Design a protein around this nucleic acid. Sequence first.
DNA 1: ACAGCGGTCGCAGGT
DNA 2: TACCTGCGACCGCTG
Length: 508
Amino acid sequence: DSQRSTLVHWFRKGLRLHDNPALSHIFTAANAAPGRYFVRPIFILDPGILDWMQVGANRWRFLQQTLEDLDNQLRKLNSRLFVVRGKPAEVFPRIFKSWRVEMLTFETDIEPYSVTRDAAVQKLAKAEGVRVETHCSHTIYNPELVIAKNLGKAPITYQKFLGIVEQLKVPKVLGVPEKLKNMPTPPKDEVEQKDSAAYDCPTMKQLVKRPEELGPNKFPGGETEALRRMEESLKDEIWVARFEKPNTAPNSLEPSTTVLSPYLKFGCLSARLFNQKLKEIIKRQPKHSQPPVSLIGQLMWREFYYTVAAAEPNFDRMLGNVYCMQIPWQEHPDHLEAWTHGRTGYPFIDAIMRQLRQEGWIHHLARHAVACFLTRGDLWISWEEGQRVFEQLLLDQDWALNAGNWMWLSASAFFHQYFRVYSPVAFGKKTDPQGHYIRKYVPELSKYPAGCIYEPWKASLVDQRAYGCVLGTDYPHRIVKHEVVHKENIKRMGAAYKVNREVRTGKE
DNA sequence: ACAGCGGTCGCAGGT
DNA sequence: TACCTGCGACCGCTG
Ligand SMILES: Cc1cc2nc3c(=O)[nH]c(=O)nc-3n(C[C@H](O)[C@H](O)[C@H](O)COP(=O)(O)OP(=O)(O)OC[C@H]3O[C@@H](n4cnc5c(N)ncnc54)[C@H](O)[C@@H]3O)c2cc1C
């Protein structure tokens, strides 16, 4: 066994065993040629990034848990995870030689950074004699094929996108890979010979530098929890079939939706598996909703944003972004800081921003509320600042999805009915008239009557004292007046739309 | 051409 | 309940 070659699967996203072609191919190959190969499933961890502030503690914890679950599952196939510390640029040249790699597989990714990184690896592999198999299993439909089907253009409307993808084939959904037979552990490389635990899963202490930012562990990481959570969500087939996104609550104390987003984001759950489960349920349920609103439709919204994002390296910025309306956002540093930390003085908005920071997930319509307030609705701050904060705090932080919906919400792309504006005060009342959500995440206001808990400034000073929370002392004065600024912002939006119309017809 | 339709998720005030 | 209308007057697509 001093003559074996190594087959490598590289996990970046797709942190799962189920429905993983790139991974299954590796395991099938090893079992086909017994005694021929060694198998190294790996995750590359840059130890320098741990202090990057664009990754919150909660997301680090989620990744830590995911890596441990992935190692446990690989253990059952007579394998394990190898978490190799370093950067791909130095790691691969070293391990290609060290491990005598014959093949390298991974799941493809459309994010710019990932496109250039992978291209470098492909170039190295080519020159070094290592075969590379890539698979597009992160999404149901391959953005490339969708764009090609639509004559070289990413569809910019949902219904057109649907019209294209129903013409495309849906790939077969795989099971978990086969158990490796006659696979002894590979010989230690020079790094392992020095430290036997060099490729072990990172500890919490290792991945999480600021444990004080950790909140309640409501959504544990990993494929196991992913599948358990999915199964629980699909248990009630009526709820699933009649799902309409607009009717789900932003402020329910428990999630009104599936909360599968962190799992789909990391690849802990296969979007293709989830799509298949849904379809089987809809066939059994005669009464059911349709896209855009349906649960299947939500999954297609994921696919839509990935397709437009795949055609635009600047997707996450206003300038140079083909889709994006050019809007004169302003700098408001105090207001930005107050929004960022849930200190706007709008209890509903503050409640949401605090849940987000604490727990890593907020409901889609809660995101609408705070995104609207930040941008077109009140503060007139750029969506790129909001995007940045979300990137830091969300467990499900996704380059394409985050950019896409921020553009939607700011009416910069895809959505253009800017006359519709969420009220920081009224929107939440509909589903939570008593303000239970506010009382929980803004505890200082928990004695306010429902009559003014969404608008504490309506309470007199004597009232404020009787509720044991005086505005300007225990809770902030509202940083702006929604009833005024939103009307003026509407006109700013109309004005900016006009300027863009000129430019568009001006190039003709 | 340029109008009419549809567009995941507005609000307030009706009924 | 779950519709409805006024508000003021958007874009992409279609033909
Ligand atoms: C300003 C803003 C930023 C956002 N940033 C992200 C992000 O960084 N990462 C992320 O995954 N989602 C993001 N979303 C979309 C959406 O809010 C979340 O996907 C959803 O809240 C996750 O909860 P869920 O899993 O219960 O969704 P469900 O309603 O159960 O839907 C199921 C799955 O469909 C997909 N999905 C649902 N809604 C959307 C949507 N609007 N766009 C794309 N895919 C969707 C997700 O994969 C979700 O897990 C953002 C939305 C807004 C308005």
